[PDB]
Amino acid sequence: DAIAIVGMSGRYPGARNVREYWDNLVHARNAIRDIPTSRWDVCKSMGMLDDIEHFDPLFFNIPPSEAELMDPQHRIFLQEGYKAFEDAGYNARTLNEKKCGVYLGIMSNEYGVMLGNSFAIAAARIPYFLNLKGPAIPIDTACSSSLVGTHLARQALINKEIDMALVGGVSLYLTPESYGANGFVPGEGAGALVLKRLKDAEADRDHIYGIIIGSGINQDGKTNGITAPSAKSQMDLERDIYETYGIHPESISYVEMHGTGTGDPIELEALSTVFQEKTDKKQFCAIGSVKSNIGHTSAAAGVAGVQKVLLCMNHKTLVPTLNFTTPNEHFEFEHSPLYVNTELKPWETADGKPRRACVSSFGYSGTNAHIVIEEYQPERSALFVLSAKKEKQLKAYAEAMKDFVTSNEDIDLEDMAYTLQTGREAMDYRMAFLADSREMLIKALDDYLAEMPNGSIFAAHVKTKKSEIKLFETDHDAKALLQTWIEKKRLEKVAELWVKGLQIDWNKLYGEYTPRRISLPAYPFAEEYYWLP
Amino acid sequence: DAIAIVGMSGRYPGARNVREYWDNLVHARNAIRDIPTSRWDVDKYYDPVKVYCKSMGMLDDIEHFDPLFFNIPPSEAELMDPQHRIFLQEGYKAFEDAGYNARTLNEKKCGVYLGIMSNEYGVMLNGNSFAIAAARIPYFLNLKGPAIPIDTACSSSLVGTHLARQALINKEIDMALVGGVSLYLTPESYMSMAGMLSPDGQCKAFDNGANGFVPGEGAGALVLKRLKDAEADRDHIYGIIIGSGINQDGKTNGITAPSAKSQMDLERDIYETYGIHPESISYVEMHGTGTKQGDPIELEALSTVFQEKTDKKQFCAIGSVKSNIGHTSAAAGVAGVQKVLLCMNHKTLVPTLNFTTPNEHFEFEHSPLYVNTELKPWETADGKPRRACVSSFGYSGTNAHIVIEEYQPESALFVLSAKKEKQLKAYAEAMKDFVTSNEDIDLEDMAYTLQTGREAMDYRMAFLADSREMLIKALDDYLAEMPNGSIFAAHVKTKKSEIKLFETDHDAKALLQTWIEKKRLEKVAELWVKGLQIDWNKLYGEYTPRRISLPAYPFAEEYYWLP
């Protein structure tokens, strides 16, 4: 039935993550810049990612020398994909042998040619690293790729062929060669979503961004030139989805258009016509395109749009679409169900109905996709733990957490700790601390970073402390003592032992109030430069 | 009230005149060819996704001109836009078709309204302004009515027709020459595709596979008069204009998009103003350019206006000659009017081409309209004259629509002359072909037309005939230079002395005057060819024949292009 989106990660022009992405959208920021000479010597504009050469190959058990031979599209998605899992609150341990499919939108080979680097391998990186067992399939339907992938993952989950799916897209523009409405400006990006059956997501107590309640794909078929759109195919696609899944156009209040700024009028007419077949209501449905902010992120276009929509729903807020002064002459808005939203405003819904939105993505090869997303409506000291594979990254992790807590005054401290305990892998470099308030939490992380002694803070490298924790691992009364500590109160003791490498049973910390996993900052990868050898 | 069309001349793809035009229409011929390299290299501009059309309705010999005929120095001819040269010829011939000549047009209050929309030749060169294009004919023939070029794109010649009509009705002019001319000289201009052109190079009017138009070249002219004047002057009348109107699309979706509402208003207002019932109309020559969004809008508009007034179904045939010749742009209106007049004259409807399956966006079955693809009799009920409309819509949004009604009217001495002997020979050839092709020609009307409705120029021939066969034989004998005692020929400048006697002597003049009545044609003939002025009216007593359409001057085919 319904598919839950339980994890997301994103890296788009002007946005290193989904929180910056949201902030940029709220403030109507445009990330399009002139192409610098460090890329190539110069349309002279692009929605660019920063530091596309950066990778943490050691994290992924990849030899540094192999990293130079990897398409950065592979490298960046590997990172974003992984972070999507961590966002959902899953780790290497909990993913091991999971029937998780990987569906990766990808549509260019630039690095391989400039020079392992097949589409087939690009999709297979994450399954190989995490020991996943669902199929790994790259999808090249051009700009519809990530949304096509979403559809396929959706169908596999519903048929119970997999129990989880990582869907995503990645697009870089590396060469000069591969490169009011007047055409589009190319964008770069990488995004991933983690999908589950809704019933599983609720039983597993995942945090849920939203649910997919309908999706479809089809073809333009014979058009006037292979890259031209078909009004009829777009209409059929949208109609068939709404009819198959019992979705009334009146229930939809936002559509993230394909909206490349070429094509535009055909898309508008199609969607308008389909809506009007079912309702007389006027100007109820806002339309936008994040391509106005970040450019045309190609294979990653679908996932960029889906993430925008989920963020909108989560904040119950509609954000401006950009570059709109006067309506396209070829379409008449006044008596349409559609209106272009250029305001930052509250996303209003009537009588506690869940917000619904659509995302469209159409490819130059004629393969179309369209999905319908519905807002999800859900029914003392804590022990904070952090770890990373190097001390430098632990420090970066602490900074990321401090920024996050500073930015989010309403964070549930118990949920956050719980996520750090159960929703992250305990790696070799460790710190832990107690806090009973936001202020104490921020102070602790500050103290850690500034190296100001603080009696609530514990840190160790696990390999150094082996002899010191053995006393607890094998003896029966030591375990009983630890269990008494963790069953339950002293937390200081649990903390000291945990940072030294002792495995803790985090479940025992909680009698019949158990907190929930929430979205937190994911691993801060080492930012090492790798390019052509 | 009514405006009589009393003369016509046309030059379209596959048709050097309106007689070939008619033949091509009857036989359902498509004139659209691939563009030859002698025009430009399509391979150097062609891209299938640059130009994406390689086809055109082309005129032949666009470089040919007879500058000496028009008192133009040969060297100036190279500097003249061929659009000007071509119209200058076609206009002049329209007058001759009507049976008017330099003498009879001198100082006439004749307006000239010329559809023209392009400057290619002038640009290539870097005299050739639109203003001068329209003014050539007035300058040559000493006409005194206003000379105005009309550029409303593809509606140009039909807007000109409306303006000429209103001037004639308001008695500001006594005659009008209306026309249009379009050539496509460069890859650049024909090019603009803007998405306009068909990749298949056909105007698929009314068809579901309509995907743009193919550019066409053409030059056409009509001579208009008030009907009352046309009847008093005993003109031959092709048809009458009984209504016309022009308007604007206004604000559309894109300045080149059409407006359903404007087309409906245009047509409705015309019919209401002039008391024309849609049921009385049996053919419409559509704008019918074969564009995907344009065609269905035109159909729906016209259908709707007809349906407001009648429940009758499928009584009005629709077609578009653009299916035959391509989209002849500024000349589109005049080409359509000329088709309709020819249809009326022959009481015949002809096929519209490239029609396989009706446009999905319009349902014909319950329409007053049907697409005619048959060569068939144009039937009318009772006594009633046939009525037809022509529509022409421009890319700039200025529309025109006229309503034409069928007109229902209540030995001989043949003389020919040209400015050079070579052209006289060509004139004799054209007449022979005409007489051969037209087995029912009235010999007395024809002679009368050659006598009174053509200028006596310097190289002359004349002969007697009492039958078609005799006429054909004489012209054959003339052409073959094989002796015939009833054929006379001379160059007038050579014969001045042999004629003077009849110009100055009182008794000679009295003898010549008796001859004209004495019933002696041989004598009149010998003298006329030598340059003697003959009072042709004296040849006729109780019965005077009527002017009819004959082949016009066959211009020298001299090549002029860029200097």
Shortest distance between the Cα of B33 and any Cα of chain A, in A, equals: 22
8 A C-beta contact, residue A491 and residue A385: no
Residues linked to residue A362 through DSSP beta bridges, in sequence order: A368
Residue of B193, B197, B253 to mutate for A, most A C-beta atoms under 10 A: B253
8 A C-beta contact, residue A341 and residue A187: no
Chain B residues lying within 8 Å of A332, measured CB to CB: 253
Give the Cα separation of B348 and B464 in Å (integer): 35
8 A C-beta contact, residue B461 and residue B451: no
CATH number at residue B216: 3.40.47.10
Shortest distance between the Cα of A270 and any Cα of chain B, in A, equals: 15
Give which of B5, B8, B12 is closest to B321, Cα–Cα.
Answer: B12
Is some CB atom of chain A closer than 8 A to the CB atom of B250?
no
Give the Cα separation of A194 and A522 in Å (integer): 14
Note whether B436 and B499 are same-domain residues.
no
**Both tokens assigned to A330:** 């070829």
Give which of B347, B350, B346 is closest to B336, Cα–Cα.
Answer: B350
Note whether A407 and A259 are same-domain residues.
no
Is some CB atom of chain B closer than 8 A to the CB atom of A330?
yes
Closest-CA residue of chain A to B198: A224
Q: After which residues is chain B broken (C to N over 2.5 A)?
A: 49, 126, 193, 410
Give the Cα separation of B258 and B97 in Å (integer): 36
Q: Residue A168 is inside which H or E element, if any?
A: strand A164-171
Give which of B332, B57, B58, B331 is closest to B202, Cα–Cα.
Answer: B57
Give which of B272, B301, B269 is closest to B284, Cα–Cα.
Answer: B301
Note whether A386 and A375 are same-domain residues.
no
Give the A window 207-236 contacts with B, CB below 8 Å.
224-225, 227
Give which of B58, B60, B62 is closest to B560, Cα–Cα.
Answer: B62
Specify the amino acid at residue B369.
L
Name every residue whose Cβ is closer than 8 Å to that of residue A420 and which is 6 or more positions away in sequence. A384, A385, A386, A520
Measured torsion, CA atoms of residues B137, B143, B144, B145, in degrees rounded to the nearest 10: -60
| Sign of the Cα pseudo-torsion (A507, A509, A512, A513, in order) | negative
Domain assignment of residue A522, yes or no = no
Contact across the interface for A225 and B253, Cβ inside 8 Å: no
8 A C-beta contact, residue B242 and residue B404: yes
Note whether B550 and B514 are same-domain residues.
no
8 A C-beta contact, residue A503 and residue A521: no
Q: Tell me the residue ranges of DSSP E strands in B423-493.
A: 459-465, 487-491
Shortest distance between the Cα of A182 and any Cα of chain B, in A, equals: 13
How far the first Cα of chain B sits from its last, in Å, is 49
Shortest distance between the Cα of A327 and any Cα of chain B, in A, equals: 11
Give the Cα separation of B362 and B349 in Å (integer): 23
8 A C-beta contact, residue A304 and residue A176: no
Residues linked to residue B380 through DSSP beta bridges, in sequence order: none
8 A C-beta contact, residue A41 and residue A340: no
Contact across the interface for A330 and B211, Cβ inside 8 Å: no
Indicate if B277 belongs to the active site: no
Is some CB atom of chain B closer than 8 A to the CB atom of A326?
no
Is some CB atom of chain A closer than 8 A to the CB atom of B562?
no
Angle between helices A231-244 and A264-276 (to 10 degrees): 40
Closest-CA residue of chain B to A327: B253
Shortest distance between the Cα of B206 and any Cα of chain A, in A, equals: 19
Note whether B413 and B530 are same-domain residues.
no
**Both tokens assigned to A487:** 């069953």
Backbone angles phi, psi at A492, to 5 degrees: -55, -40
Closest-CA residue of chain A to B52: A225
Specify the amino acid at residue B138.
P
How buried is residue A453: exposed, middle or buried, by Cβ count under 10 Å (0-12/13-18/19+)?
A: exposed
Give the Cα separation of B317 and B297 in Å (integer): 17
Note whether A197 and A53 are same-domain residues.
yes
Closest-CA residue of chain B to A328: B253
Give the Cα separation of A409 and A394 in Å (integer): 23
Domain assignment of residue A312, yes or no = yes
Note whether A58 and A92 are same-domain residues.
yes
Give the Cα separation of B151 and B155 in Å (integer): 8
**Both tokens assigned to B366:** 């319950």
Q: Provide the 10 A C-beta neighbour count for residue B278.
A: 23
Instruction: Give the CA distances from residue A296 to residues A14, A30, A255, A302, B331, in Å, rounded to whole numbers and listed in that order.
Output: 14, 12, 17, 10, 46
**Both tokens assigned to B308:** 């407001």
Closest-CA residue of chain A to B252: A329
Contact across the interface for B211 and A224, Cβ inside 8 Å: yes
Backbone angles phi, psi at B283, to 5 degrees: -145, 140
Is some CB atom of chain A closer than 8 A to the CB atom of B254?
yes
Shortest distance between the Cα of A35 and any Cα of chain B, in A, equals: 28
DSSP letters of B306-334?
HHTT----S-EEEE-THHHH-B-GGGHHH
Domain assignment of residue A73, yes or no = yes
How buried is residue A241: exposed, middle or buried, by Cβ count under 10 Å (0-12/13-18/19+)?
A: buried
Note whether B297 and B201 are same-domain residues.
yes
Chain A residues lying within 8 Å of B211, measured CB to CB: 224
Note whether A233 and A364 are same-domain residues.
yes
Experimental method, per PDB record: X-ray
DSSP letters of A34-80?
E--TTT-----EEE--S-TTEE-TTTTT--HHHHTTS-HHHHHHHHH
Locate tokens 């849920």: which residue? A208
Indicate if B287 belongs to the active site: yes
Residue of B49, B198, B297 to mutate for A, most A C-beta atoms under 10 A: B49
Angle between helices B421-437 and B468-480 (to 10 degrees): 150
Give which of A357, A352, A365 is closest to A290, Cα–Cα.
Answer: A357
Q: Say how many CA atoms lie within 13 Å of B458 toward its Cβ.
A: 9
DSSP reduced 3-state for B33: strand
Give the Cα separation of A129 and A57 in Å (integer): 11
Note whether A369 and A411 are same-domain residues.
no
Name every residue whose Cβ is closer than 8 Å to that of residue A417 and which is 6 or more positions away in sequence. A382, A383, A384, A385, A515
Domain assignment of residue A527, yes or no = no
Domain assignment of residue A432, yes or no = yes
How many distinct structural domains can be found in chain A? 2
DSSP reduced 3-state for B262: helix
Q: What is the 3-state secondary structure (H, E, C) of A374-416?
A: ECCCCCCCEEEEEEECCHHHHHHHHHHHHHHHHHCCCCCHHHH
Give the Cα separation of A385 and A492 in Å (integer): 12
8 A C-beta contact, residue B339 and residue B285: yes
Give the Cα separation of A22 and B461 in Å (integer): 94
Helix and strand element counts for chain B (H, E): 19, 20
Residues linked to residue A55 through DSSP beta bridges, in sequence order: A528
Contact across the interface for A330 and B253, Cβ inside 8 Å: yes
DSSP reduced 3-state for B5: strand
Give the Cα separation of B488 and A31 in Å (integer): 91
Give which of A520, A524, A516 is closest to A441, Cα–Cα.
Answer: A520
Q: What is the distance of C-alpha A435 from the center of its chain?
A: 29
DSSP reduced 3-state for A314: helix
Is some CB atom of chain A closer than 8 A to the CB atom of B385?
no
Measured torsion, CA atoms of residues A384, A390, A395, A401, in degrees rounded to the nearest 10: -50
Indicate if B401 belongs to the active site: no
8 A C-beta contact, residue B323 and residue B203: yes
Full domain range(s) for residue B477: 445-542
From the candidates B154, B203, B343, B389, which is the catalytic residue?
Answer: B154
Give the Cα separation of B483 and B231 in Å (integer): 42
Give the Cα separation of A224 and B197 in Å (integer): 12
Is some CB atom of chain A closer than 8 A to the CB atom of B563?
no
Cα three-residue angle B319-B322-B323, rounded to 5 degrees = 70
Q: Where are the alpha helices (DSSP H) in B251-377?
A: 260-273, 294-307, 322-325, 332-345
Residues listed for chain B = 563
Give the B window 510-549 contacts with A, CB below 8 Å.
none
Q: After which residues is chain A broken (C to N over 2.5 A)?
A: 42, 115, 179, 262, 379
Name every residue whose Cβ is closer than 8 Å to that of residue B113 and which is 6 or more positions away in sequence. B134, B148, B150, B160, B161, B163, B164, B176, B177, B178, B179
Give the Cα separation of B421 and B427 in Å (integer): 10
DSSP reduced 3-state for B336: helix
Name every residue whose Cβ is closer than 8 Å to that of residue B122 and which is 6 or more positions away in sequence. B81, B128
Note whether A307 and A396 are same-domain residues.
no
From the candidates B110, B287, B316, B401, which is the catalytic residue?
Answer: B287
Give which of A317, A318, A324, A268 is closest to A291, Cα–Cα.
Answer: A324
Instruction: Give the CA distances from residue B426 to residues A399, B468, B548, B555, B557, in Å, rounded to whole numbers and listed in that order.
Output: 99, 19, 20, 9, 11
Longest dimension (CA), chain A: 80
Q: Provide the 10 A C-beta neighbour count for residue A487.
A: 12
Domain assignment of residue A317, yes or no = yes
How far the first Cα of chain A sits from its last, in Å, is 49
Give the Cα separation of B118 and B188 in Å (integer): 12
Cα three-residue angle A496-A501-A502, rounded to 5 degrees = 75
Domain assignment of residue A71, yes or no = yes
Out of A225, A329, A331, the one facing B49 most closely (by C-beta) is A225
Among A364, A379, A394, residue at a domain's last position = A379
From the candidates A74, A151, A207, A258, which is the catalytic residue?
Answer: A258
| Sign of the Cα pseudo-torsion (A115, A121, A126, A130, in order) | negative
Shortest distance between the Cα of A331 and any Cα of chain B, in A, equals: 7
Give the Cα separation of B111 and B332 in Å (integer): 20
Out of B49, B211, B254, the one facing A330 most closely (by C-beta) is B254
Note whether B537 and B488 are same-domain residues.
yes
Give the Cα separation of A148 and A154 in Å (integer): 10
Give the Cα separation of B146 and B165 in Å (integer): 13
Shortest distance between the Cα of A273 and any Cα of chain B, in A, equals: 15
What order do you get walking across the sheet with A429-435 strand by strand?
Answer: A382-388, A429-435, A457-461
Backbone angles phi, psi at A414, to 5 degrees: -65, -40
Give the Cα separation of B386 and B494 in Å (integer): 52
Give the Cα separation of B92 and B136 in Å (integer): 10
Contact across the interface for B254 and A332, Cβ inside 8 Å: no
Domain assignment of residue A112, yes or no = yes
Closest-CA residue of chain B to A265: B253
Give the Cα separation of A167 and B237 in Å (integer): 78
Angle between helices B521-530 and B506-518 (to 10 degrees): 130
Locate tokens 């050839």: which residue? B429
Contact across the interface for A224 and B199, Cβ inside 8 Å: yes
Out of B199, B211, B254, the one facing A329 most closely (by C-beta) is B254
How buried is residue B493: exposed, middle or buried, by Cβ count under 10 Å (0-12/13-18/19+)?
A: exposed
Contact across the interface for A329 and B49, Cβ inside 8 Å: no
